[PDB]
Amino acid sequence: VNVPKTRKTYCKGKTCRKHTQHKVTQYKAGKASLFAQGKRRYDRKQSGFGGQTKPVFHKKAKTTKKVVLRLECVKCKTRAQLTLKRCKHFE
Amino acid sequence: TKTRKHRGHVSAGKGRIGKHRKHPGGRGMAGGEHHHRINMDKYHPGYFGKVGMRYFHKQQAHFWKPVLNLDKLWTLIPEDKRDQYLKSASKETAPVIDTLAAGYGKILGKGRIPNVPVIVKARFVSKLAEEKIRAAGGVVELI
Amino acid sequence: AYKYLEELQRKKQSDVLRFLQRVRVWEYRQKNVIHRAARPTRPDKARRLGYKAKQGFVIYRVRVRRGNRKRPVPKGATYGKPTNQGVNELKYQRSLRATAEERVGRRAANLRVLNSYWVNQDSTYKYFEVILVDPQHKAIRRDARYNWICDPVHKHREARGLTATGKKSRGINKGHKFNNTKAGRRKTWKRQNT
RNA sequence: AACAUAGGUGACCGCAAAUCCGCAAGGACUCGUACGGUCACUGAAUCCUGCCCAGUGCAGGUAUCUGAACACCUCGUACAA
RNA sequence: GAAACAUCUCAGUAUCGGGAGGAACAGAAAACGCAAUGUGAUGUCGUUAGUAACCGCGAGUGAACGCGAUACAGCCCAAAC
């Protein structure tokens, strides 16, 4: 729920060093979708159901929605993602 | 043979009447997916999977061999006499490649060499080809 | 030599050309398919593509329709993509150009065509000229140029029918090496239609 | 006992109409014009035909909200996406 | 066919409309791109190759340059004057 928000140690990425404290971030930002095959492919080949236009895509969504939160190592300040858990709420 | 004998047994092949006909279902391989027991049975041929390997550079405008192993050469000299031509000193090197298709002429080093000791000249040579070369004899190539 | 009748026929809204265009097709309009003409509308282009005063040459206008569509609807079994289905959206591959050239030729059965191209038309139909030749004529079968469009019709026959022309032999082909794949080895037939 | 029917009722339309056929060129209604003719419901006569507009449908209006593409502006790209 | 099915597939197939010849059609580069001090019209045959490429990236689909052959053949206008 409202965790871990913490100082930890593991840093395993492009820029690292000894395990040092990082923090949680819940990074949310950036452009959304239509960066991948899809908008490009419906530029062309649009006649009457090509590709899987008709089918629902990106799977169905469930109650939760994983977690995001990059954990940046305070120090180098550069970090990587870990597995995401489906948290009901993050605070 | 067994196939030759067909008559004499009702139904040929799998014994049954109303036996195997168009089945199990689908055409060719059934859908690579689930079906109502039509086809499945956990697979992993493929896994990854888009048959064949291809590299865009790999093609025209791609690097090409020929490659030679430092085995044929040593086998070639000094142990047995071979191409008398292109022979000088204890030994020498030069084109002994099936194709002089260009962009090529490297010599790999595998097997036991120098042993000739041989000196070779060709396009770039692998590291494990300098050694077991430059060692007894051998050296720079195709500057 | 005939530059600006090329230059002029660019804008078609410039000045003099436009006025002639105001009074032109007024008469052409209210003139039906099949006409005929003493001279070509653009003298540079005729006498470019191939037109000279000489006997055995004839140039005709043609009108067409306007936009392209006009098509029947498919029967049932429409349900599907649909693939070949659709209605007013599809445009036909043949140009309202190629269509002008035949729909001429099938007016004058006797003669063939090196094809000119249109003058512009508005709110509806486009026009087109279209020179034709005549195969069994004299002076036609004289000048080396403007020969061989009549031998006498041994191979070339109903050119533009087959297709061999200008706009056709374009349309279903352009360029040469490169992008001539699934195009003219000779053409669409062979290298199954694209 | 079903359909039709006269009779009752509602709806659209002033004709370059409403309704309908055709890919188009064109066409039926129509040598017609609202006392018309199209689209529907009920089904002679007699006595009558209550209450409901929330949902659905149709129609009218609408400050505000939502509402596509072209053209316009900003960013981005020596251009473009 | 994809063991359903919509894109895909069967297939530009069946069938339809128009038309030529003894063969048609193509054809003398606004080409190729083994990138080169390289090739030199166009068909076709063999190969390149089930390769590149496409595709619910599923099932399926699917070239070309080049090379070895066959046969070789290059020219006429518009305009300038």
Kindly write down the DSSP assignment for every residue of C120-177, as one continuous string: P--SS--EE--EE--SSSTTTTTSSTT-SS-SSSSS-SSTTTS--SSSBTBSS---SS
CB atoms within 10 A of CB A13: 14
The first and second tokens of residue C153, run together, are 């019709």
The first and second tokens of residue B25, run together, are 């279902």
Beta-carbon contacts of residue C121 (< 8 Å; ≥ 6 apart): C25, C28, C63, C127
Q: Which nucleotides of E are covered by protein (CB under 7 A)?
A: 1-13, 18-35, 42-44, 50-53, 55-60, 63-65, 76-81
Q: Give the integer Cα–Cα distance in Å for C86 and C72.
A: 9
User: Does residue C116 sit in helix, strand or coil?
Assistant: coil
In terms of residues, how long is chain C? 194
Cross-strand bridge partners of residue C131: C59
Beta-carbon contacts of residue C191 (< 8 Å; ≥ 6 apart): C181, C182, C183, C185
How was this one solved?
A: cryo-EM
Instruction: Give the amino acid at C66.
Output: R
The first and second tokens of residue C136, run together, are 């069994």
Among candidates C101, C129, C155, which has minimal Cα distance to C35? C129
Q: Give the integer Cα–Cα distance in Å for C140 and C111.
A: 11
Are C98 and C171 in contact, with CB atoms under 8 Å apart? yes
Among candidates A75, A65, A64, A68, which has minimal Cα distance to A24? A68
C16 touches strand D (CB under 7 A): no
Number of H helices, E strands in chain A: 0, 2
C90 interface with A at CB cutoff 8 Å? no
Beta-carbon contacts of residue C168 (< 8 Å; ≥ 6 apart): C98, C101, C160
* Touching partners of B (3+ C-beta pairs < 8 Å): none
What does the DSSP 8-state code read for residue B70? T
Query: Element (H or E) spanning B68, and its range?
Result: strand B67-69
Do β-strands C62-63 and C58-59 pair in parallel, antiparallel, or remain unpaired?
Answer: unpaired
Do β-strands A72-73 and B67-69 pair in parallel, antiparallel, or remain unpaired?
Answer: unpaired
Are A68 and A79 in contact, with CB atoms under 8 Å apart? no
CA(B143)–C1'(D22) in Å?
A: 83
Among candidates C128, C124, C129, which has minimal Cα distance to C29? C124
Chain A closest-CA separation from residue C164 CA (Å):
31
The first and second tokens of residue B104, run together, are 């090529």
CA(A77)–C1'(D53) in Å?
A: 66
Do β-strands B67-69 and B106-108 pair in parallel, antiparallel, or remain unpaired?
Answer: parallel
C155 interface with A at CB cutoff 8 Å? no
Burial of B138 (0-12, 13-18, 19+ CB in 10 A): buried
C82 interface with A at CB cutoff 8 Å? yes
What separation in angstroms does the CA of C63 have from each of B38, B51, C59, C118, C119? Answer: 61, 55, 13, 9, 10
Q: Give the integer Cα–Cα distance in Å for A16 and A10.
A: 9
Cross-strand bridge partners of residue C132: C58
Which residues of chain C make contact with A47, given a CB cutoff of 8 A? 81, 83
Q: Give the integer Cα–Cα distance in Å for C86 and C89.
A: 7
In terms of residues, how long is chain B? 143
The first and second tokens of residue B79, run together, are 């142990």
Cis peptide bond upstream of B24, omega within 30: yes
Q: Give the integer Cα–Cα distance in Å for B112 and B73.
A: 10
Are C141 and C74 in contact, with CB atoms under 8 Å apart? no
A48 interface with C at CB cutoff 8 Å? yes
Number of H helices, E strands in chain B: 2, 2
The first and second tokens of residue C47, run together, are 């006498």
Which residues of chain A make contact with C82, given a CB cutoff of 8 A? 48
Q: Give the integer Cα–Cα distance in Å for A49 and C65.
A: 32
CB atoms within 10 A of CB C186: 9
Whose tokens are 């009108």? That residue is C63
Structural resolution in Å? 11.7
Q: Give the integer Cα–Cα distance in Å for C32 and B69.
A: 82
Are B85 and B96 in contact, with CB atoms under 8 Å apart? no
Q: Give the integer Cα–Cα distance in Å for B69 and A37.
A: 45
What does the DSSP 8-state code read for residue C74? P
C70 touches strand D (CB under 7 A): yes
CB atoms within 10 A of CB B117: 19
Whose tokens are 């080895």? That residue is C185
Query: Element (H or E) spanning C28, and its range?
Result: helix C25-28
**Cα first-last separation, chain A:** 7
Cis peptide bond upstream of B78, omega within 30: yes
